[PDB]
Nucleic acid binder design. Sequence first.
DNA 1: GCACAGGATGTATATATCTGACACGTGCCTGGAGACTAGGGAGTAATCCCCTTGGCGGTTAAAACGCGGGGGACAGCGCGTACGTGCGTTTAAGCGGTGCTAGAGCTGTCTACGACCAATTGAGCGGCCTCGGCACCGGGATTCTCCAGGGC
DNA 2: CCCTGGAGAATCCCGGTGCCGAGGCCGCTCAATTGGTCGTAGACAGCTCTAGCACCGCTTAAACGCACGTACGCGCTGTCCCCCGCGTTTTAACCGCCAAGGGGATTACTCCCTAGTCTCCAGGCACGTGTCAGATATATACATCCTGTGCA
Lengths: 96, 96, 85, 80, 444, 109, 109, 97, 96
Amino acid sequence: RKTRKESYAIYVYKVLKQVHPDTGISSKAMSIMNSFVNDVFERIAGEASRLAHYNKRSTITSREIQTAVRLLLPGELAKHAVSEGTKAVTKYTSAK
Amino acid sequence: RKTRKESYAIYVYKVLKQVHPDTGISSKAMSIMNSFVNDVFERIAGEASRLAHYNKRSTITSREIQTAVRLLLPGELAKHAVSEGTKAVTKYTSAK
Amino acid sequence: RHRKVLRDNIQGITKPAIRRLARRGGVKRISGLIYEETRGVLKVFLENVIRDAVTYTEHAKRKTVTAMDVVYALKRQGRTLYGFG
Amino acid sequence: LRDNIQGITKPAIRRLARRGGVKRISGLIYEETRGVLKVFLENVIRDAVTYTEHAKRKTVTAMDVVYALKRQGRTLYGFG
Amino acid sequence: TRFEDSPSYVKWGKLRDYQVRGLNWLISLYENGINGILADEMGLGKTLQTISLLGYMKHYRNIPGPHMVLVPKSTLHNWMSEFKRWVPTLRSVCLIGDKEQRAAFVRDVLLPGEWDVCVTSYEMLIKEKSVFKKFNWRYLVIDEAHRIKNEKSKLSEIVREFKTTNRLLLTGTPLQNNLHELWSLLNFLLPDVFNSADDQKLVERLHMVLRPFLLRRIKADVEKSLPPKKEVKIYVGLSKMQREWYTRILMKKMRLLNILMQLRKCCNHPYLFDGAEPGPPYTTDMHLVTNSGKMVVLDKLLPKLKEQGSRVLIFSQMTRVLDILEDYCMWRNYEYCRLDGQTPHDERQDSINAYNEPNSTKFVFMLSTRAGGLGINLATADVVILYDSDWNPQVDLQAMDRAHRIGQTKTVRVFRFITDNTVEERIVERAEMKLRLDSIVIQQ
Amino acid sequence: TRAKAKTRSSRAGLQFPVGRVHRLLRKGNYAERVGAGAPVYLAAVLEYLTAEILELAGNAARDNKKTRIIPRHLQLAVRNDEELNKLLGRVTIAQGGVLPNIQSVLLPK
Amino acid sequence: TRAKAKTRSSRAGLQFPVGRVHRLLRKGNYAERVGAGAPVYLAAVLEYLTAEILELAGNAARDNKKTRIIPRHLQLAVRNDEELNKLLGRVTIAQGGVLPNIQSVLLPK
Amino acid sequence: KPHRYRPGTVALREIRRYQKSTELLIRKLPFQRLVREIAQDFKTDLRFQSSAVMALQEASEAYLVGLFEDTNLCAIHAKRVTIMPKDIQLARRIRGE
Amino acid sequence: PHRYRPGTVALREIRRYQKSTELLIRKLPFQRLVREIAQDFKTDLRFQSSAVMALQEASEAYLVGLFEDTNLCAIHAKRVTIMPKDIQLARRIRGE
DNA sequence: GCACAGGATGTATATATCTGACACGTGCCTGGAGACTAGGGAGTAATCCCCTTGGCGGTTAAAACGCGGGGGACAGCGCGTACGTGCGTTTAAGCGGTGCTAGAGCTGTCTACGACCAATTGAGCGGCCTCGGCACCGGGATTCTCCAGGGC
DNA sequence: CCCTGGAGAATCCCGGTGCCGAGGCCGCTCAATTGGTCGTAGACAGCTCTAGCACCGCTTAAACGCACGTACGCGCTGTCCCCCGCGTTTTAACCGCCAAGGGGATTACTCCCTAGTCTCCAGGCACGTGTCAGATATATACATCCTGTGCA
Ligand SMILES: Nc1ncnc2c1ncn2[C@@H]1O[C@H](COP(=O)(O)OP(=O)(O)O)[C@@H](O)[C@H]1O
């Protein structure tokens, strides 16, 4: 038993079952999806860090994340992502 | 009294007098030099941080700085910069 | 009840100005259809840069666009500019 | 070792060009393609070897290759 | 105990009482080594007094030193003609034209040093500052001295840079907005006397301080004519569209950056805004008057005055408002004459001459408030309508006196249109404060 | 006592790990502090992008009469969508191939 | 007692602020720990790069028969040198102009 | 009878002149109006600084100059001397824009 | 005897290889080339199989994109044959 | 149909002037250096076993070589067309002002709410096994395409 | 000079094999809970300098419209040789298998290097201030195009 490796595989599988209820994925495709998730996380987090440094803050917030997704995602993807993220933050605020 | 703004102008002027004693520099060229220094600093520091994260460490050392220099600079500049940095580190650790 | 429009602002980038840019680029002969194409390309480039700059300004909770915002937008686009901070 | 770039053969270059979508190929294309491949591989392998030496390993890893490709602006999905 | 009669060097005319006493005051000023401001209203021979002073300083005192006169471009020909007519003995030169003419002039007439008086303009002074720096000027005369009233201005900085032994400010209205302008003028005059930044504690102290530096004579020494003006303020209410746009602008797609500048024209006419006018057909019929209270009152008043004495001048601060007025007059088939900043110089003279013909069909003359070059002799008018009010009361005073000239024979009515409960009330209050300050300081 | 543990992902109705995202933000040297809404927002954005790509790839795999998504399907889905193509312009997908495309000049006349 | 203060730049033989570099590294959110020799190495590297660029720009200025460096001289120095051209390929210099270059086919013949 | 240069010598003189200078080749006021018009579509009630428009003009001129260099190279590749929208589009397509 | 015209088989190969997804270079020669190139920077280097596979994938993608751009250059020249001049033009416009 | 002379244009070169920005000097204050203590990160040694390298034999797909021919590349030619060059007219850019107000940057204070830190824990998630269904391989019959010959 | 008529390639349709994806079970470590605290950012107040909006005056360089002539883009044709499709022989890649050992990966231990704190002081930054380098103008000297004209 070697060290433990983290991956987004189970969450990607949950999303896949939600989207296409009776479709599967292969190991190579799952590795590609994990790489994509890591790359997008890195881009958004780095842009948010740059914004925080530019404005001379010390905290990464939902406003920084929203500005980062506006900067990085193109057009309609940015609009839909902003809507979904705002929805999630609103539900988390109400339910907590 | 206006706020304090930090810049590398004093040190750029010192290096200019060291390498070309009878030579001046305008304000806009000083802005360009300051921007160049900031950009190179940010590139090297980001590469060193990425190296530390890749190798699962938490300290930025002269090894990280040297590797970042080798990754970012093209060949002859890289090797001359390595020589200069090694000279500086050796002189710093010699009796201080 | 009086009105008078002047011209499109994209026409302010004139044919002699485009010719001067082509001369600095090293062009000898220029076709007559080049000017509209150049205006479109310039418009697209400016649209991208200004959208990023306005996003930065809105995040900073400001209504004034700064050279810093322009520099950050250009760095995002991959066109680092020296000489403005 | 030596005489290994010639191991990249004319049929292989033709297959690559066909996947690129070209019909007729000049006879001088093959040496030019070999040179381009050499320069690209040299850059990538140089960066990967720098990463490996910093890690103080004797083995070059797929993660090192991926990091070199990413720092050259050629992100590769499917190896980590 | 000074020169009691017209001098000898002045030919073609005998100087009258006010100008001879002004010349005595200027001579006493030079003798006491003090520089002063000559504010003799607008048209009682300030140019003639300056010319007589220069002639005196050249002839009765053998000092042929160089002299410079700064004037607006519009007055250059008049100044040169007067110099040739009244005191032909002195040699006066002018610097005008493009680069070739300027260089030819400086190489041919200026540098050799045969000239005695130089009559240049503001722009030519800014162009040739380096050339003008060399000479050791004796007398520096600045016509329309309110041009340098703002420090940090390039003209004021350049004129202070010069080297002179005597100075003389020539203005009509020294105080316009605030005492900082007067301090700037007095700092140019005597930098040593006035160097700091700034009814016994005030008023009287100001009068006694400024008395040895100023000489003003209101247009009452001669009179015998010029029936007094009657000013009436007409209050108007916003129309429905004006009210809606006013509320929408106050609460908040067109940009609204200068909110005061949007409230202004909103008081003038909603048609100035994009989309407020009705649809694309773009007709001109009865929805222009009914959408503005000022338009309603004006449409009630203009036919009345035309049945009455007519010859009405309309002064406005907006060329867009002038366009709307032109459309209204064309609809009503009046005769409208327009004078604007964009009107070419030849058209201005033709328009004023046509409006001033002994018998002409012209009824409405439309002018921008500050576009006049302080001339424009419209002495045939009867009613002055200030459609919009300016912050500076002196601008409105000049607009009024363009119809209150010497040739006027019938009393003039000044109708000032003010909207109730708007920013125009604040504008009028500010103008009243400035006018009261100017009256209490200078007019007394 | 202690209440029953509820995951923040369940509180936000997401299928992505909010706590894991928060830990990655804290360990990544991005800023001194991290807010409460930033992990939720980032997880939601990641979930939306994953859903979009998976939907397009599943449709492509359906057109190929397959039940499993492979890198070829992923590449087809990415390159046939303008937004995802602009987002992943500088990305190479292993074993993804190229789009079928022949210039009209090369076709027989 | 208390020995006289000596700057790390002086002890290293550099003309650049080693202490300011250390402070910027610690405040830049790159890592939670910073070694002692890393600021020295970085300052030396920055000094070498600045010296190279300034020497080339001064040579260009002397070629143009001027004693003050301008952005045009900086651009001429950055170009014409393969190392610095590659290092600053994606960088625009304000009012730096372009290199004199005319293609051979355009020359009269 | 009047003196006239050949069709292309004045062009080469202009090339040398504009490759020797460093100034901006676009009129400031028209460029500023264009920038404000473009910013209108993204946010009304927007104000600009003088430095922002200057930086935008510099970046735009540099981009256009580089594009024209690539366009000239493509035109020379096509055995031509006159640059064309075909050349501009090919340059943009290869660069990835 | 049946003989296809000069260009039909090329189009068939184009369609086949654009439909396929496998590697187009021989793995052992590619590995030998990679090891030979690696001998320049360090001695007695060892490689993972995944590393060589990733290098080969990157090389395939780079060459395919370059050939697409070269074909576009050839079409611009009103030709159907691609040439080293076309390859050089593509590299120069790309920025290499 | 060539080679050269001269005219005209532009460009480079010297010199004189002037100005405003660069380079220097001063005060002071804020950040860097000096000395010291605590604590965790990384260096070092040792062990395990995974993975990498080396070697061999047999298949067989793929590469190399040669041949015969048609299609593409390239040089030459001719034309009529769109662009360069110069000139006279018009426009608007650029500079200098008025008059007012809000935006933004800074300095300085207050204060409170949200994020960090620590101890406890229990459920989520990763690793290992296992099995059955989809992907793959092979074989057969279809449909489509491309090329040639000529009666269209 | 397109219409049949054959060949060759691709495609659909069945049937048998294998191995990998999806599920299920165990165990641990990492996120959730609760409590306490502090310090960062929001809020407020005052000052000062810039930007926007509607105007005016003036100067003058630059854009604009126009006409003429000329390189040049573009079509067209011919020639030739070069690349391509096909068949044959050689070659080494590929795959399965075995064997040995180097080095990656993990763990345990300890020390030493950095973070954090408190003093103290001096180096860098804002502010004035003078003067010299570079821009600009003006007048020659020279280098470049262009054309006409004489001549073999
Ligand atoms: N010969 C004269 N001398 C003095 N004043 C005159 C003379 N002729 C006319 N005026 C007055 O001068 C006024 C306009 O002259 P203006 O240009 O104002 O002169 P100034 O600038 O010297 O006051 C007229 O109203 C007229 O009454």
